Amino acid sequence: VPFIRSLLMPTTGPASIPDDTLEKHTLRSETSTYNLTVGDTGSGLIVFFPGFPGSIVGAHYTLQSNGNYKFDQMLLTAQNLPASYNYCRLVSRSLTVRSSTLNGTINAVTFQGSLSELTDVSYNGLMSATANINDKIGNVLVGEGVTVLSLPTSYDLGYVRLGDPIPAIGLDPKMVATCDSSDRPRVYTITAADDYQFSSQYQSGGVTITLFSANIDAITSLSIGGELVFHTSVHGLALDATIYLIGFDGTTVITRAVASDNGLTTGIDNLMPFNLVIPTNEITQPITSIKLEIVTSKSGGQAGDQMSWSASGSLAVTIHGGNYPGALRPVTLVAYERVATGSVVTVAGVSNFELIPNPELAKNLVTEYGRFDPGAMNYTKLILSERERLGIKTVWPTREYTDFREYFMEV
């Protein structure tokens, strides 16, 4: 049964998903190949988005001497799917990670949440991220390697829009226009202040505060809306507010001005709206947190003068298509340590998809409904329900995965 073969052995090629999502489509296999370099602590982390419906496979981070991670690069597919296709569905995927340059070990786990929801990302802490014995693997020798196999997080998923470019012309050569993954958005609601009282002595240059900081996840476009209302009895106060989207490594990935020299009028509701749209091309690395900064200042102010105001307000962060299964969750982490500095950790995999070509390609790419295979879904359901008894893992010591492949091409 082709689909089962594709599901369990992605490197053999694609097959159509035997569900009820009957769209005329085409099937494709995209490889991923990377030779990553080990930093001086000999330790690092690769974050994989096993169910990502598109070209984003993961991100590599090296562990620094000071204990912080540092972003290296994204891991994508051989070609950029949005450039040739407009819609996509993930069929199957598998990636292997091993050193190619003995030295070191790998710990790996499949977590059912999104990146920022992990409570512990240390080499050893990962082993507890899940309680499923078949979703974690420990101290595998780097030379032997580990294999990440993508297992379903729901079928009958709709096709996802790929963030493809749309026809557009503009004065700015840096103009960008796309149609993004949107169906099934994820929404975070943050009530930053409920009659929060701010008070402080003047200061030339203003007084800065960080109203709040929250963990959120984003890999592609998102928007931030909402409003803060300020009340004050003091005259001459002005506010400056800024939103920061922080990366997994602690760096600032994006900053947006929300208020600039916004003067506060006494005894009135002062409105501070948020109308931000963050496009995919601006997100250089996965975003794991958001924070708001407010700077309070008094132009005609003197030492001694108090600056104060009261605020209430809620924001809504919308990650477009964020709740589409595979888009942000689950996550598979592959951590390595004790690897010789300057070694090469080699990544190699295959992603299989159901796709709908963009207009230009549609002129030459035939699309179809796809082989009818009466018992394929039942067989898949049966296999997955016996997952523990059959030992079907999401993370494998590669040698065992290889044995599993043989034991299968048997039957």
> Which residues in 152-171 contact Ca ion (CB under 5 A)?
156
Nearest distance, CB of residue 44 and a second copy, angstroms: 15
**What CA–CA distance (Å, rounded) separates 401 from 63?**
28
Select the binding partner of residue 305 from Ca ion, a second copy, none (C-beta < 5 to 8 A, by kind).
none
Neighbours of 133 (CB within 10 A): 10
Neighbours of 183 (CB within 10 A): 14
Nearest distance, CB of residue 58 and a second copy, angstroms: 15
Nearest distance, CB of residue 334 and a second copy, angstroms: 14
**What CA–CA distance (Å, rounded) separates 153 from 97?**
23
Residue identified by tokens 């420990």 is 138
Select the binding partner of residue 55 from a second copy, Ca ion, none (C-beta < 5 to 8 A, by kind).
none
Decide: 209 and 257 in contact? Cβ < 8 Å. Answer: no
Nearest distance, CB of residue 71 and a second copy, angstroms: 20
The reply on whether position 172 binds Ca ion by CB under 5 A is no
Nearest distance, CB of residue 64 and a second copy, angstroms: 19
Three-class SS of residue 139? strand
Task: Decide whether 203 or 367 has the Cβ nearer to a second copy.
Answer: 367
Task: Decide whether 304 or 323 has the Cβ nearer to a second copy.
Answer: 323
Cβ-closest position to Ca ion: 20
**What CA–CA distance (Å, rounded) separates 274 from 224?**
6
Nearest distance, CB of residue 305 and a second copy, angstroms: 21
Q: What is the DSSP string of 258-288?
A: EEEEEEPPTTS-EEEEEEEEE-GGG--S-EE
Task: Decide whether 147 or 358 has the Cβ nearer to a second copy.
Answer: 358
Distances (CA, A) of 313 to 190, 192, 368: 8, 6, 50
Task: Decide whether 282 or 304 has the Cβ nearer to a second copy.
Answer: 282
The reply on whether position 406 binds Ca ion by CB under 5 A is no
Residues 8-37 within binding reach of Ca ion (CB under 5 A)? 20
Residue 143 backbone phi and psi in degrees, to 5:
-65, -30
| 308 bridge partner residues | 199
Decide: 258 and 274 in contact? Cβ < 8 Å. Answer: yes
Select the binding partner of residue 297 from a second copy, Ca ion, none (C-beta < 5 to 8 A, by kind).
none
Task: Decide whether 211 or 234 has the Cβ nearer to a second copy.
Answer: 211
Select the binding partner of residue 136 from Ca ion, a second copy, none (C-beta < 5 to 8 A, by kind).
a second copy
Decide: 245 and 284 in contact? Cβ < 8 Å. Answer: no
Nearest distance, CB of residue 291 and a second copy, angstroms: 9
Select the binding partner of residue 35 from Ca ion, a second copy, none (C-beta < 5 to 8 A, by kind).
a second copy
User: At residue 384, what is the residue type?
Assistant: L
Nearest distance, CB of residue 156 and Ca ion, angstroms: 4
Task: Decide whether 179 or 377 has the Cβ nearer to Ca ion.
Answer: 377
Q: Give the angle 276-69-253 at the CA atoms, nearest 5°.
A: 15
Task: Decide whether 156 or 360 has the Cβ nearer to Ca ion.
Answer: 156
Neighbours of 163 (CB within 10 A): 25
Task: Decide whether 46 or 142 has the Cβ nearer to a second copy.
Answer: 142
Residues forming the site for Ca ion (CB under 5 A): 20, 156
